[PDB]
Design a protein around this ligand. Structure first.
Ligand SMILES: [Zn+2]
Ligand SMILES: [Zn+2]
Ligand SMILES: [Zn+2]
Ligand SMILES: [Zn+2]
Lengths: 386, 396, 396, 385
DNA sequence: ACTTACTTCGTTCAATGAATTAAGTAAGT
DNA sequence: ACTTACTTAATTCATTGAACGAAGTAAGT
């Protein structure tokens, strides 16, 4: 990523994208609020807003109440300038959503398919629905495709390095969709990252710039947001906190290591510990509340493991806030008090800074909205790099 | 941390700082090569270079070999445009260095003084030493002061929130030094971040853009660099991997928690475990629990010191394996006075840490040791000032 | 010296100073009358008036009676936005005044002190007095210091080149005072120019734009105003009509020349001619040669005093006739100490001076006396600051 | 009244200022304009475009390269228009058609006894003005400038009185305006017109301050301070020639007794002569030949002129005095005496010397000066209304 | 002759900030 | 229903200063 040369195009783009983003955030806003918050004289907004309206990305809104005074006319973000299609690839099915530029779902469908070991066919099935959801619309307005998957992703290339869930290896997902949509960006990322984009744009991100998102289900996912940016490692390759070692020589994990955190702090623990003594999360939780000794032990220890996992996310990253999301299970059923009891005693609370641990305020559609946000985030990012 | 308004001042800064940096990294370069690398027409570069030469930060170099073609004149970075003073605060001494703008040490000195619970005294002594390090030079050429410290730092306010090692609490370091030097920037950061900065500019960073820096010795420090940027959490507050819990209900750490990685993967382990092992190995020759002493007794064959040293290596290995799984840093660079005894732990670290999530998927993470000497801690502190002064000021 | 560049800062100043002066001139006026007079739309005036009110130099006044008609609100000049200190330097005393922005005297005092050949002592005493004159007020509201002096002045540099009456030679008055008050303008001008400013702002200037001001007393001073501007010659150096030669090879004057008008048309003449007459009138009751004493004995019927007074009135008349023929001032205002005994010379002045070039062509030049009192010299000095502060800054 | 502050005022200030620098130099590079007027080259892009669009400047020749694309000189169009100047004398009416530099293109003299025939004189002016433009487009005529001997009301353009011509209350401008309603017409005294010539073509090329003193049949004085001529109330000029130097002295034509010009001008010869040929040239020559009466007249006129000039220096502080002969050769005056007397003054006594010298200009300057009445108005920065 | 390197002169365009138009409210007769 | 007096919203245009383009010189192979 090299910084763009300093010139007039860079000046125009910076001011138009910044003003545009404030308008997105508010939905509607007066020229005067934009001026105060972005430090622009009204005459500069004359040219910026004129260009944006000419593109069709903003619209004239309603007249505001008079305070003197000529009545101001609201500047409205055109959420329908275009649309996005998002896809979520699951074991049993392919979920789809056509969304507006606010990531609000307009249409959604589900196509059942056995995606395990047949990526070629899954891609073609994706390409088909993408074309079908735009069947009663103009495909010029299709601004991109966003894909959420469970696995390891090379974001530099848009390839799925590995997906244990689906039995995929080195699938050039983006390359294959690009043959069907050459002018349309196609982005793939892991589920936890798509969900985190949903929190950033629709959830916790509306009041915080820093938080960590922890998904607990069949595995444990972690995505850290610092200053409204998600942390990725080298070459854009995401870190894998779920596969940190907590017990040397412990349960054999599907990643090839022994003793991974997610083998103790996720639903996998029930499967593992179960065999050593039904183990689906919801049944185990019910049985626990009913006082079954085995079910209470599993829920209790998973809660302890999760607690130490979350404490270490806090100590390692200094996220300020941790959001727990259930992935295929209801997080309110977790031993939340234990998790909080353990993780709230950390390095930073010891020094006078509390870190709040809470649960998501978003619903299931957020996974798909997040996948769409992969595209929207890219479209509205101030283009200072090349 | 917000983007500046798009205007002529912004683009003027983007271009002149980008050109300046290109000249600075190459030491010497021609106008044609700058123009080609930066996509400028010659007239554009002409004006940018005039401003820089008039400031005195670049100088005319010698001519180069012909390629056609008139002989192009090199443009040279004036490494002596100004100078920097760096400081490293330790329990029993204060270290000082005066560097050029490439962070090369021109002078350095150290003094005995106990800063333990004596912040006003230490700070007054540091101010006098900054003045003395300038010697006969022009004070107007002092570009800043950079300070490496062991503790918890608020980089925004320049305050040391806490340093358990020094017994300091809520010390307005930057502000107190601004009372003596009002017209110059003064920055403070953790020791590990200073060293990483030195690594970024003078070591591993010259050839790679991603790496984790792990200091082993009297403690355990971690800093991660991704795409030439050091990771910091919320509000610019550093992460604290050394204070991750590896053993619930384990050794009490100076941070208030129990079972921190630092209590098992550093010198602290020898004192914690040593107390427990004394009666189990009565014949042992270990008189002291400092790193160098434990290394000598283990390398001599003492059963207790080999257990202590080998166990510390194991815990360190698992710590590094978890650095890899968590951050995906591409490479891990081990650092610190603990390397003086690398022969005793590097093999165990490599055995444990080479098996990780990423190696399971076909990506090997190199684990190596630093190629920088001990002065890098001081150079790193100097680079706090240099990094900040040469950074393209895109943010306001 | 030259006109400012045409840009937004210039037009901003032209408009806000023009509106400010309109308000200041009228004391209180409405937005509508300003807009009417200055040809502005109401929105334009709204912004100009916001700036002025925010600075605190105009205030919101009371409502005006309806014209049919929402009630228009008066805009008032804040005469107390700041204050000014003025000084008058005499041989035997230093006079001080503190004035509001209408040049109205709030306070004034005087002190005995011999400034003769003692500029440094006098200037130190003036500086301590400026400080004391401020009293309980905020020094930040002292807009300046204006000084009236008898002598030759370089107004650019603020230096007294020469003052024969004080024995001062190349005294950097303004620079020496700037040592005490660096952020405050300090102006110096001759007594006659100070009084003329007072006349321009508080007296004759309220009704007319052209007049010559002539001071009679212990000297003769002239200042000419045409189109509300005081005439100055080359480099801003004042003209010196009092030092015109009326009698070749005549009385030696303090300026180095012989026969100057001032040696015949002022008190100086009583001393020069008095010396030559003593023996021709031994019986005469006239002891002293000061103005009032000569007037007393002449009004009592003394042959010597009547001759001295009659002649000086005659020479004064010819001096004024030539002021008229030379400048075409439209009006001549007589001023000074000497007015106390106007009954003895005003008739002769009128007889001689009313017959002039312009009266011969049908244009009569009115010759009158000032309607201002003694404090006008101090007010004039204060007006050096006020004039300069409220002047539309079109030059630089 | 100052003009309101707005964009038109901004435009005019910068265009007129840049235009004036170009007139001063004849030709100049855009870079010198930029450095002299503190403008960025891009601001000049628009200023020079507007001025070229008007046809008041032209593209000049290229300049020697210094690196370096060659700069193209920006040239003042002295022929954008022309001016007609008139000088009203006792025996004749002189005329000149000049370019915008006041350089004489065409000139003529129309013999006429203007004494007591004002309407007629004005009709000859209007006709010759109309004829001077016989071979040139009339809309290029930018104004008419008239130099006259006498008293002038400049607010109205009327000749209040001219003793030379026996005119009284003649509405010169009003009468010419009937023939040239779109053309400005300016009237002023000869001395003021000559001073404009000095200011643009002579002493004004090296000085911002000077007094011009004409010595002929009468004594004229015009004072320039900071490149502006001093006028009295309502623009009515002062009359230093009619200051009293001798109470009950020679009866002057202004109605006063003892005026300076009755002693320090050629009138002194006529006056003193009768009390004992008195034309200046004959008296000067007779004096050089040792005639006792002629030497006395020349000696005393010199002393009187000397005291007159000393008092101009003392009154006005002009920095320098320029002596001009009007109908006579100034070099024939007792210049050393004038200098001896006048150089001892108030200001030289205080360390500031005042140079007294003679004009470097020739006779056509009177007419060039009258044309400059119009030119000075056209090129003045319109900051007022 | 060709190439490469550097310079200086002069233009374009986005932002800026002053007046100014656009379109109301505010409060009387 | 008028009339006059204020307010706030949003636009125009001359200047500005950054890159950029025009059109040369400079000094080699
Ligand atoms: Zn695993
Ligand atoms: Zn700890
Ligand atoms: Zn004198
Ligand atoms: Zn006369």
């Amino acid at each position: 990523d090299i910084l763009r040369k300093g010139n007039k195009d860079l000046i125009k783009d910076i001011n138009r994208y910044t003003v545009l983003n404030l308008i997105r955030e508010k939905g509607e806003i007066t020229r005067t609020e934009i001026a105060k918050k972005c430090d622009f004289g009204m005459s500069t907004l004359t040219y910026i807003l004129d260009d944006l309206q000419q593109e069709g990305i903003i619209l004239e809104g309603a007249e505001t109440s008079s305070t003197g005074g000529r009545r101001a006319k609201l500047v409205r973000f055109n959420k329908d300038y275009g649309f996005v299609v998002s896809v979520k690839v699951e074991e049993e099915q392919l979920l789809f959503a056509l969304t507006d530029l606010n990531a609000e779902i307009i249409e959604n469908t589900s196509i059942p398919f056995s995606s395990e070991k047949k990526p070629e066919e899954a891609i073609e099935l994706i390409a088909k629905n993408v074309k079908k959801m735009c069947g009663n619309r103009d495909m010029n307005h299709l601004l991109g495709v966003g894909i959420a998957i469970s696995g390891l992703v090379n974001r530099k290339k848009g390839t799925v390095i590995r997906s244990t869930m689906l039995g995929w290896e080195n699938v050039a997902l983006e390359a294959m969709l690009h043959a069907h949509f050459p002018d349309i960006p196609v982005y793939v990322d892991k589920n936890i990252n798509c969900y985190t984009l949903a929190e950033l744009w629709l959830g916790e991100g509306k009041q915080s710039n820093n938080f960590a998102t922890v998904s607990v289900g069949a595995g444990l996912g972690l995505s850290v947001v610092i200053n409204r940016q998600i942390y990725y490692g080298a070459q854009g390759g995401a870190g894998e906190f779920g596969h940190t070692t907590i017990q040397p020589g412990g349960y054999k994990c599907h990643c090839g290591q022994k003793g991974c955190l997610e083998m103790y702090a996720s639903e996998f623990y029930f499967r593992n510990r179960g065999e050593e003594l039904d183990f689906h999360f919801d049944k185990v939780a019910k049985s626990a509340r009913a006082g079954d000794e085995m079910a209470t032990e599993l829920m209790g220890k998973m809660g302890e493991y999760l607690g130490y996992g979350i404490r270490n996310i806090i100590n390692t990253f200094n996220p300020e806030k941790v959001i727990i999301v259930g992935e295929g299970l209801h997080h309110r059923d977790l031993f939340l008090t234990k998790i909080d009891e353990i993780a709230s005693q950390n390095f930073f609370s010891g020094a006078g800074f509390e870190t709040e641990i809470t649960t998501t305020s978003l619903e299931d559609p957020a996974w798909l909205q997040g996948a769409a946000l992969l595209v929207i985030h890219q479209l509205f990012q101030v283009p200072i790099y090349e």
